[PDB]
From a paper:
Mitoribosomes are composed of a catalytic rRNA core, encoded in the mitochondrial genome, and an outer shell of mitoribosomal proteins. The T. thermophila mitochondrial genome differs substantially from those previously characterized. It encodes 43 proteins, half of which are soluble, varying in length from 59 to 1344 amino acids. To characterize the T. thermophila mitoribosome, we determined its structure using cryo-EM at 3.30–3.67 Å.
The resulting 4.0-MDa model consists of 92 different proteins, including two bL12m dimers. Of these, 46 proteins are mitochondria-specific, while 27 are newly identified including 9 Ymf-encoded with previously unassigned functions. In the large mitoribosomal subunit (LSU), we identified a protein binding two iron-sulfur clusters via CDGSH motifs, mL107. In T. thermophila, we report that the assembly corresponding to uS3m is composed of three separate proteins encoded in the nucleic and mitochondrial genomes. The resulting β-sheet, therefore, consists of three different proteins assembled to make a bacterial-like uS3 NTD. As a result, the buried surface area between the SSU head and body is almost doubled compared to that of bacteria: ~40,000 Å2 vs ~21,000 Å2. In the T. thermophila mitoribosome, although the 5S is missing, no RNA or any substantial protein replacement is found. In contrast to the prediction, only four bL12m copies arranged in two dimers fit the density. The local resolution of 3.2–5.0 Å in this region allowed modeling 150 residues arranged in eight helices, which belong to a nuclear-encoded protein that we named mL105. The topology and sequence of mL105 suggest homology to the M-domain of the bacterial SRP binding protein Ffh in its ribosome-bound form, while it lacks the GTP binding NG-domain.
Residue numbers in the entry: 1 to 262
Write the structure that this text describes.
RNA sequence: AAGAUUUUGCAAAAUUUAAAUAUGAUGUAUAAAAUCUGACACCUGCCCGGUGCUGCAAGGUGAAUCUAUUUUAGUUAACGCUG
């Protein structure tokens, strides 16, 4: 879960920085794993609809309990695995009934740690006195806390903070009407209910922000192809195309203005 | 590769079609789309008059429809109908 500063034995390893993907601690399974068709920015009729997208050597799917309401036993963590699209880690979880699943892990966890889901107040977890990375109801939480994968009361799935190093800070708590006012990563505010649910602690890989690819072939092997300027392009192909590289206004090929107030 | 600006808070914006839909993505602002420059180091200065873009209280110009008011023509023996 740490950065690697490489010694400049090549041009591309001079600035590169990447995370230890922890292959020794990834016991791979065939229970949660599918590999679907790679969608290269196309529809079913073959036509490109979103550009700059292609082959992905790291295509997979791993089914996850974003919602951990269905069991309350205590658990451990046997192993780990990595996700690419959000650059987040996960970890298996073995419940005391020998059950199994994957979960979103929080920052500060690792093999050997414990985790559970909580129906009742905090004093009634005699196991698992530490509380990080646990599925909990927002009312049954401290004054100060931060949530990372939120499931609203009027909803099945989670729609906020699912990316790396994110959270949802609390601004207020209104237990009267059971209505919380949480902050998003941007800064906007949203009404949520304390009957809703979420995880505790920021999601894994806080340190993706301190990354440098250093090689074009690290994106090509994800499904990120080569972009092209609208200025090298011919006037047929793009509304900037031509010999002049200056342009009032600054536009998009389907026709609309990108830069506003500008 | 890297840097900056602009849009998008989730049945997301953008994209495809006449439409259902397809899709972005079973991804959630450390994400997605567009745009100009182009490793790294030092720097990236003054000006919002002009054009362009965005926004727009009050004010000015501003279409039909509804309503009210005013003015007026033709025709009929008459009431009246109509414009
Ligand atoms: Mg096309
Ligand atoms: Mg792109
Ligand atoms: Mg380019
Ligand atoms: Mg040319
Ligand atoms: Mg043409
Ligand atoms: Mg043209
Ligand atoms: Mg020239
Ligand atoms: Mg540079
Ligand atoms: Mg420019
Ligand atoms: Mg001005
Ligand atoms: Mg204007
Ligand atoms: Mg106006
Ligand atoms: Mg006005």
């Amino acid at each position: 879960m740490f950065l690697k500063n490489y010694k400049p034995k090549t041009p591309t390893l001079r600035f590169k920085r990447d995370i230890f993907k922890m292959t020794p601690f990834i016991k791979k399974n065939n229970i949660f794993f599918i590999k679907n068709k790679n969608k290269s920015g196309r529809s079913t009729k073959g036509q490109i609809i979103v550009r700059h997208r292609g082959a992905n050597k790291y295509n997979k799917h791993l089914s996850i309990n974003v919602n951990r309401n269905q069991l309350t036993n205590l658990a451990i963590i046997t192993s780990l695995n990595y996700i690419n699209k959000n650059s987040c880690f996960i970890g298996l979880i073995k419940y005391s009934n020998n059950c199994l699943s994957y979960i979103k892990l929080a920052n500060g966890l690792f093999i050997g740690n414990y985790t559970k889901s909580l129906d009742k107040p905090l004093n009634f977890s005699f196991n698992f006195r530490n509380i990080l990375g646990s599925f909990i109801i927002l009312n049954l939480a401290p004054k100060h806390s931060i949530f990372s994968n939120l499931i609203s009361f009027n909803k099945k799935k989670s729609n906020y903070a699912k990316s790396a190093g994110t959270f949802l800070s609390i601004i207020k708590k209104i237990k009267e009407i059971n209505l919380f006012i949480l902050k998003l990563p941007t800064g906007e505010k949203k009404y949520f209910s304390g009957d809703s649910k979420a995880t505790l602690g920021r999601n894994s890989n806080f340190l993706n922000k301190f990354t440098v690819t250093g090689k074009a072939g690290i994106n090509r092997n994800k499904g990120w192809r080569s972009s092209v300027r609208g200025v090298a392009m011919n006037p047929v192909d793009h509304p900037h195309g031509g010999r002049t590289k200056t342009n009032q206004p600054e536009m998009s090929p389907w026709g609309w203005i990108t830069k506003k107030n500008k």
